[PDB]
Amino acid sequence: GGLTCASAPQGTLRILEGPQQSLSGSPLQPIPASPPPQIPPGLRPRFCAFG
Amino acid sequence: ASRHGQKGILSRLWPAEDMPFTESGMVPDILFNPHGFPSRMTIGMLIESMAGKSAALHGLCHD
Numbered sequence: 001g002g003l004t005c006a007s008a009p010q011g012t013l014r015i016l017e018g019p020q021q022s023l024s025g026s027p028l029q030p031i032p033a034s035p036p037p038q039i040p041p042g043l044r045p046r047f048c049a050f051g
Numbered sequence: 052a053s054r055h056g057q058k059g060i061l062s063r064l065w066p067a068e069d070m071p072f073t074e075s076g077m078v079p080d081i082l083f084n085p086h087g088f089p090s091r092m093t094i095g096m097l098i099e100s101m102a103g104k105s106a107a108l109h110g111l112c113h114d
Contacts, residue, residue: 037114040109047075047108049074050076
């Protein structure tokens, strides 16, 4: 009436919960790159010679 | 000192009438020997001079 060893298991199942990968879009930056410093339009000379 | 590591003591206070005046009437207030550039390669000072002169001329502020 006691507990005895039974037949060895024939296989093992290991369960884990996993989600999946999306598409590669690689959206690097809101406003991207190093935007260049640049000329103010027209500007004009702010200096003249004497005479 | 400048913002580029170019330190140096003040050796003279040159009279304001012995300074080399420009064709615009101006007269520098700092005289910096041009021989600190060749061995120290601080090309950022030569760009800061032009950027600051352009800023003072146009009333701008460059980065």
